[model samples]
Target chain A: MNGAIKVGAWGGNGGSAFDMGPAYRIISVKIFSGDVVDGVDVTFTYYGKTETRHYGGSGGTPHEIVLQEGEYLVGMAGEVANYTGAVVLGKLGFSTNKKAYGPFGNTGGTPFSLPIAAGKISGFFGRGGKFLDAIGVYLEPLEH
Target chain B: AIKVGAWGGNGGSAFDMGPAYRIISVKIFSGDVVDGVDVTFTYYGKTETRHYGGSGGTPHEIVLQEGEYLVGMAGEVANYTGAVVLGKLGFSTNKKAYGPFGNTGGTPFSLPIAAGKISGFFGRGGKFLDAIGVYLEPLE
Candidate 1:
């Protein structure tokens, strides 16, 4: 079954897996961070109704990424850092078919990247609680 | 564009961002009564920030979720130093509602929209949040 491919869950694995399960189009992505990356949320649809899922902690400074029509996520990049003796996600950036969005929060940690070609991103998955511990993506194969 | 109350005294200059802009966060400084409000949003091509009223109370940030924006609000107006000011304030979005920050013992105002959004805000401010209002746009 040619379906979505899973990618890296960058950063330390600390919390529960926030899986979007099986989804269609990813409408938007919201990141809440200040000193380091704190939380992340996603908005998507599942054929019937639109839905949204929040992960990690709710911080002060935040930003959102709303896709333009026909735009699909193609790449993601981030850094993993040390927070009070604990390693966690420090920053994140997203790329779509149209343009680049962000590398939200302050970037400076163990860097990792996921850049895909001939595929699109449909959903996101990661481990999070209080702070976004890890992050990954679902590479939805382009339909022929 | 629908309008609402601008209760309290006319303190500072008006803060209006016109229409089509989405407010991302609202940092409200409130205690038993509203002290002030700071808003952050997109303007032109940059994220702009605006502050109104005096510095008092605790600053609590109300950050909207993904795809969520301000829709409506309910608040009350009161008297401060012989001039009217915002007493209590509450903001609602497509996700949920927040605040009523401050004591609600004053002239009341509620502009709840069933289907639409608050694109921009209007009203004057200064040392203390004076008068406040909003610009509404129907769903497309």
Candidate 2:
């Protein structure tokens, strides 16, 4: 199995959202910004559970989460965030744009499911900061 | 454009090999030594699947003719607790004849290239993890 799963979100920038598929164990989260000083708060809601993390600049770090197969929402906030990054247990990364981001509504907040199968990632970015240039999500698979 | 597919290797092992223009052999790497997994390949309306990585611990290589093909994962043994990583889909074509194609999680995709090969890294349980950089030699 070789490939990279990537998704992007576009909008103003307050609470942007995206959706993910497949049952994956997210290994890390990343945040991209124009200025290194720009920081943002990200929230992931899945299977009736919500997890949020803070990213300061552009880069990725390890985060552990076993996600089931289904749709997922990735929310972002803080000073017009540009991109959001996620690394699944088995996949890599890629560059994406608006068309890739899926249908999303302003949950007005953060802190957020599916089966043990694999699916794609999609979501929307909130509007508040600068023009949401883009939002990105990465994924890999989990081995049992 | 060249088409490629991937899946979990026998016993779920991580593997890395390729850069060949024409596919020579498909190898599987089982971190545990006692686990094996399955690999599948499809080309020009033809498909082949096989098993690799086990107690025997021999590098299994499946040879193929020079042509465009799609590779993927099939299945694994029962009660297997080993880590299965699909190594590389060896090709026999000219490294300069192809370029990198887009990657897929588990879906088929079509590209608009005349001739080339698809390659990437795959995880266990038959899932596409990340695409190794597709190097497209200069078009003749």
Candidate 3:
């Protein structure tokens, strides 16, 4: 199968307004289809300003994940560096805590404007930061 | 008895929007040659805005003494190529006027655009901002 997803407003970037205590949820995950050969999954990871903090969690199914009053950049499960193709069957998201706090810290609020392809999500949050861990799920095709 | 073949007035370019100047001369006679002539008129207020072509179109002719002085809305040598008659003082609009008719801004009746910078001059873009004098008359 083939499709894409958009994740936003997780609020971990080092902005005073973002770090406020409020648990944001994955409101919607619209999935499309192509030539269904296997299933797919969704995952998440946290990226700090200077480094990444891999948040180990359960993949598959939409679930609420609470965040503390701190900053983070998030992505899916994959090789932090040299991850050319897709990972976790066909899903991807945050990297480990990718940036740290400093004059040259990560400020978050970067929009992801790429199609989530089968087995690959391409782009970077911060150029010189770390990749966080992630959770994934095997998605089932919808009956139409 | 002597006859003067001079034609002068305002048309293109820009003019201030307040009180108008008195016509120093007004008469109409055709087929008279006009060139190498200088005339002056005054207006009131601060004029601003580049005069653009619209509605009534650029002023084409300023009538005087039964004769018509050629007035252009925009300066273009190509449009007035045939207007090179020595006695035919062709007046082209400066194109830089703040507003049409009179001043949209406070600038008074000073010819908003400069001459020579009309269509064929080198370097400057031939966008006359106000009326530029280029009239002439026969030595009656």
Candidate 4:
């Protein structure tokens, strides 16, 4: 069922729903930055093998990444607000199909971006607590 | 889990199905254009249909009602003899909006979900449906 397309999580709704469903692709992303966005870890291909998981709670400053071998992603930017009483996410970045990664944590709130086409994409989901508040994606074009 | 994007014009061959949890029905095979759609749902431990693109229109179907869910969807896409099909289509649930189905004429697309659960679907078809997209989910 490889035609995924679930976009935008941006930020808020106070954590606890982090999904990483839809696999057979995606290999690396660690992005846990300080001041907010304190957790995230991924490494794909589940239900098709190779796992990684790990979401929220490891307090900031990580930034792993690791795509190569035909890269992917396509676009995403960040920023969100109202911390402390719910509504998180705070800064982040992404872009592939070659180039532009991370804005990572801290830079204030309210920002968003999309971009599309890397064969449309097919993985990632969101909501996390203790940091990593919201995120979403899953598109699956390219087969025409 | 909030996704939207899939608006016609690519012309056939590129299907992809569910993130499906349980999607009772959907037939939607219009005439006068928009011809294709079969989608039954709930694969991997039960029921699954997913058939053709052109049986020559007029099907309709649209079931759903045992927990009901099919979130949202919209339509409009023109140009026939040069390709670019799907003239009008519609689906929505939580209650309401079963069809915009064919014949409105050209350019207007829609997805509109504010959260999660549209389960599955992807674009491009064979004798008719070409270019469409979706797949939203963020389960509890």
Give a tens-digit lDDT track for model 3, residues A43-105.
Answer: 233242222221212222332223333423332322121211211112233322333211111
Choose the strongest candidate by TM-score.
1
True contacts kept of 1: 0.00
Expressed as tens digits, the lDDT of each residue in A1-144 for candidate 2 is: 123333222222343333333234342333332222132345556676666655333332332323334423232222212233321111112222211221122212111111112322332222222222234433333222
Tens digit of lDDT per residue, candidate 4, span A1-144? 333446556677776887676665878888988876777888787566887788777787898778898777766767775666667777878887778887788757555555453344567778887888888776655554
iRMSD values, candidates in order: 21.7, 12.4, 35.8, 10.0
Identify the CAPRI category of the predicted complex in candidate 4: incorrect
Candidate 4 error regions (>4 Å): A1-55, A59-61, A64-126, A130-134, A137-144, B1-52, B56-58, B61-91, B94-112, B115-122, B127-131, B134-140
Q: Encode model 2's per-residue lDDT on B1-140: one tens digit a residue.
A: 11122333343334433223333344533332323334455444655554433423344444445543423222221222233332322223332222111111122112212222334222233233222222221122
Residues A31-132, candidate 1: write the lDDT tens digits. Answer: 898878889878887767888788988874778889888887777777888886656788888888888877887858666555453456666777887788
Which CAPRI level is candidate 1? incorrect
TM-score of chain B of 2: 0.29
- The C-alpha TM-scores of every prediction are 0.48, 0.23, 0.13, 0.30
lDDT for A94 (candidate 3): 34
Fraction of the true interface contacts (Cα pairs closer than 8 Å across chains) found in each model: 0.00, 0.00, 0.00, 0.02
Scoring only chain A, what TM-score does candidate 1 earn?
A: 0.91
Chain B TM-score (each prediction, in order): 0.87, 0.29, 0.18, 0.31
| Candidate 4 per-residue C-alpha lDDT over B1-140 given as tens digits, one digit per residue, 9 for 90 to 100 | 33334567776787767457777888888877778888888777888888656767788988988877776777777888788977878888877778888884776655544444577777777788876666666433
lDDT of 4 at A115: 47
